[PDB]
């Protein structure tokens, strides 16, 4: 995002702006919970490809 307005309220912009598509799904990284070769296996990693 390009910045908008002062920095003083910039959270309450982005708090309410991503109030919707944040509890939607997950981010691309989940692999901090994933052990190694759980990435190498065909399930549990749609981001393998």
């Amino acid at each position: 995002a390009a910045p908008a307005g002062p920095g003083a309220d910039m959270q309450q912009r982005f708090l309410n702006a991503w109030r919707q598509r944040l509890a939607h799904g997950r981010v691309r990284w989940v692999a901090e919970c994933q052990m190694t070769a759980e990435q190498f296996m065909q399930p549990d990693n749609a981001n393998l490809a």
């Binding site: 919970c33 052990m35 759980e38 549990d44």
Partner: protein, 49 residues
């Protein structure tokens, strides 16, 4: 639970109880065959068109 345990195996934590694996196998073997003489009748017969 079916979900509460599901974190614990996928991340790699032992939930205080264990398992026993059971599998099935199949092979291809070879055989010899022994019988005494005259161990069976084996009649022989007529042909039908």
């Amino acid at each position: 639970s079916p979900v509460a345990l599901y974190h614990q195996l996928k991340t790699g934590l032992h939930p205080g109880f264990g398992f026993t694996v059971v599998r099935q196998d199949r092979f291809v073997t070879e055989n010899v065959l022994f019988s005494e003489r005259a161990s069976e009748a084996y009649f022989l017969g007529q042909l039908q068109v």
